[PDB]
Design a protein around this ligand. Structure first.
Ligand SMILES: [Zn+2]
Ligand SMILES: [Zn+2]
Length: 53
DNA sequence: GCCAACGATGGC
DNA sequence: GCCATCGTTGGC
């Protein structure tokens, strides 16, 4: 992907942390789905927008 | 330039 | 049709 190196810790992570702002936004964590980004811990360390990590 | 919010769509 | 999560935008 443009935003995934597929090779760092973040990219290999399969489990949302459930605790960050992005996770708390998610439907599966009871959130309003207004932000719509991946878990902070799954934000590619190389390729993600710097503000997402 | 940032970012909260949202439109878009590939993949299922 | 839905979902995950991307790129875009308007307001600051
Ligand atoms: Zn998280
Ligand atoms: Zn990565």
């Amino acid at each position: 992907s443009a935003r995934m190196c597929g090779e760092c810790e973040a990219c290999r992570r399969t489990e949302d942390c459930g605790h960050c702002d992005f996770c708390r936004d998610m439907k599966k964590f009871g959130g309003p789905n207004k932000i719509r980004q991946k878990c902070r811990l799954r934000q590619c360390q190389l390729r993600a927008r710097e503000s997402y990590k």
